């Protein structure tokens, strides 16, 4: 329709479009504060965690890498950050 | 096969749209008035005109058919065309839409009696 405001686009369209083709290019990823029942420490895990993680105090599994964002464990609590 | 050719289709268009008040549904009398409304050279052709004329008048009386428009249907259409009421439908009898129709009032400085009810998301 030849008239768009390309300076303040709608956030629905920002979530629709690609993470590179966004007007301000930036990530769609995030970090998580993940708590395991076998440890008291807090661990910052990436959403696309990309590598199996052990804890600083104990040997346990809390993520499983895949093609996109990794699958968190069933018996493990998580919080966004 | 007794289909009717273009000359007796076209002339039976013409004298029906021009002489429908003078026309009568009976074949034996519209045949005789074809002589006084038009100069048909041959008697057999005049029978072909009048037979299709009483066929089409038989079709006109069971509701009007497009392609034919005589004088009476014009003023009948004009009687339909002068349909005016004292008052019409949409009125201030009670905008029942979402907040965009509130922005119809708010943004450019108007004062309209809104009853804003948003659509289901």
């Amino acid at each position: 329709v030849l008239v768009q405001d390309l300076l303040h686009p709608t956030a629905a369209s920002e979530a629709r479009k690609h993470k590179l083709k966004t007007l301000v290019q930036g990530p769609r990823s995030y970090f998580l504060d993940v708590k395991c029942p076998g440890c008291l420490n807090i661990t910052t895990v990436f959403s696309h965690a990309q590598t199996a993680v052990t804890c600083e105090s104990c040997s346990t599994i809390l993520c499983t890498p895949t093609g996109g964002k990794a699958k968190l464990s069933e018996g493990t609590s998580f919080r966004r950050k | 096969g007794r289909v009717r050719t273009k000359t007796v289709k076209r002339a039976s268009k013409a004298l029906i749209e021009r002489y429908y008040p003078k026309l009568t549904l009976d074949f034996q009398t519209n045949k005789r008035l074809c002589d006084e409304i038009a100069t048909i050279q041959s008697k057999r052709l005049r029978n072909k005109i009048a037979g299709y004329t009483t066929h089409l008048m038989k079709r006109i009386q069971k509701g009007p058919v497009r392609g034919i428009s005589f004088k009476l249907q014009e003023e009948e259409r004009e009687r339909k065309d002068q349909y005016v009421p004292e008052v019409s439908a949409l009125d201030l009898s009670r905008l029942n839409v979402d907040n965009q129709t509130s922005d119809l009032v708010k943004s450019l400085g108007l004062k309209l009696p809104l009853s804003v009810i948003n659509v289901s998301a």
Partner: protein, 206 residues
């Protein structure tokens, strides 16, 4: 400016809800995308009637701008809106072409059905596409009652309305005939409605 008497009262919103004008086609073209609120889980897209009514105000404000009502043209081709076009012609000048368009009506001056329009209004550009292309030769503005999937080439005023429910096309002619009649004259104030139902505009079998 706009006076305060142009409220979309819930009595005519109930008419739009009865005519099923708000819900429409299954897919939306890019020139009808701002006329859509959102999507539904069953797949039927919705049309906001407030912007439909405001475009109907604009279309009526162009029809009533021409001093002659006889050189305004209403176009229908399918049986779904023949009676609504003829009843639109029944209150204003608004010369109709209901049924076959017989191309050569805006050009080709030797035609008996040749006309001299200053504005055309069509039921839909999809079914009346020959009238749209012929009006693009004479410099005629086009007011189109567009669907979402309806192409909108060579049209100028698009009113988004449903064309699947029977009462939807009749009501969108009925409100447009209402608003052109108010803007011309010979109507009393907007405190009370029409005496009978809008069933006189809709197509009936037979």
């Amino acid at each position: 400016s706009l006076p305060a008497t142009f409220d979309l009262t819930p009595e005519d919103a109930q008419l739009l809800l009865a005519a099923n004008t708000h819900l429409g086609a299954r897919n939306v073209q890019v020139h009808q995308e701002p006329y859509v609120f959102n999507a539904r889980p069953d797949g039927v897209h919705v049309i906001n009637v407030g912007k439909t009514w405001e475009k109907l105000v604009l279309a009526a404000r162009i029809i009533a701008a021409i001093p002659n009502p006889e050189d305004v043209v209403a176009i229908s081709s399918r049986t779904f809106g023949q009676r609504a076009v003829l009843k639109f012609a029944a209150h204003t000048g608004a010369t109709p072409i209901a049924g076959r368009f017989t191309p050569g009506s805006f050009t080709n001056y030797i035609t008996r059905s040749f006309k001299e329009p200053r504005l055309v209004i069509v039921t839909d550009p999809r079914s009346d596409a020959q009238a749209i292309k012929e009006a693009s030769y004479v410099n005629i503005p086009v007011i189109a009652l567009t669907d979402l999937d309806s192409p909108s080439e060579f049209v100028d005023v698009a009113i988004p309305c449903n064309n699947r429910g029977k009462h939807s096309i009749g009501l969108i002619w009925y409100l447009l005939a209402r608003e052109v009649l108010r803007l011309r004259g010979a109507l009393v104030d907007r405190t009370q409605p029409w005496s009978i139902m809008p069933d006189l505009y809709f197509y009936r079998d037979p």
